[PDB]
Amino acid sequence: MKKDIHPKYEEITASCSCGNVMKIRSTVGHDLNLDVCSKCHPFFTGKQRDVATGGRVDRFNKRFNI
Amino acid sequence: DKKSARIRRATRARRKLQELGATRLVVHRTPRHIYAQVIAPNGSEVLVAASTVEKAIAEQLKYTGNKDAAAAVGKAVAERALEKGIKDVSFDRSGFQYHGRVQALADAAREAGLQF
Amino acid sequence: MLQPKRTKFRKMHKGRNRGLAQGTDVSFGSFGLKAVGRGRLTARQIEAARRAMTRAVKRQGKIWIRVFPDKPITEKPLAVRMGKGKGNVEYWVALIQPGKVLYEMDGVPEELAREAFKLAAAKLPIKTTFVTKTVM
């Protein structure tokens, strides 16, 4: 790499709400607090639940009984 | 690719010495070894040659592809050229940069007595 | 009327028309109308002989035209002296050597092709003949 032209790229710590402590090299300098990491992102549960089509016949039979 | 672009990078100065009628020193550089040979102006026969593939040079060395081996090669080929009476040559870098092992070789041949 | 859509140049030398032809054998169809004489045809002579054989076959079968008029022919106007530039392009011709197959035809019987090509050759200035396909 060249000497002077590049920004400072320093290893810092980024911790998350799921407690995922992760040390990365970054240009931030200070420590980082996250919200979701790849461990705690609802890609493996939430996107599966979040379709939620529901049935029209089951709503109909649900609203009463004959 | 890299071999071909090195040849394209070398084939101008080779044809220039071809029309100059110059007895020419040919350097060839690998990551492990470095080669040298003095070629007649007809381009079809050699006069002297040295390498880090030779036992008499490689056995005195640590690694065949560093600058100290390249200087030992350029010294040996210069001492063989002056033994055979070849004094004035022209250095063909063969598409490499005049830098590092190539420069240390040519500086060794200049120091040992060749004139180029 | 056949005519090139584009040309690299607008005018052309008069040239000559010597030599034998190349399109000699009946390539595509079964029957052919071969030129024996020498000369130049036009788009009018070509289209008139095409109409005469298309009508003589009652649009049955397929007709190829081997030639194409690509040579421009200039003329000077009336009451114009011989200098002052090359004349204006008036019409288009095709140079015809002996042996050139002019037309081809199939899907019809031989006698119908004879009488159709005869009606076409009656529209042409040059002397023609009737030919058939040949193996080799």
Binding site: - | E19 | V80, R81, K84, G85
Partner: protein, 80 residues
């Protein structure tokens, strides 16, 4: 009466070509070929000018020959 033209022009003939042919003894400096490009190429003892003119650097006979992978035409001076 009437007309005109736009096609009256042409330039002067530059007298290019091969001035000395093969097997033809020349003096040093003698022009062999005048040409626009390198339709021919300079071989042994033959220089190429500013306008791609091929001149003899020495004395001797002209040798035409075809060399190279591209089959380019080279002109050389044999010794004499």
């Amino acid at each position: 009466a009437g007309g005109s033209t736009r096609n009256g022009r042409d330039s002067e003939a530059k007298r290019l070509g091969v001035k000395r042919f093969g097997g033809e003894s020349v003096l040093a400096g003698s022009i062999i070929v005048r040409q626009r490009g390198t339709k021919f190429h300079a071989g042994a003892n033959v220089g190429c000018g500013r306008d791609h003119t091929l001149f003899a650097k020495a004395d001797g006979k002209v040798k035409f020959e075809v060399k190279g992978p591209k089959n380019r035409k080279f002109i050389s001076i044999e010794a004499e």
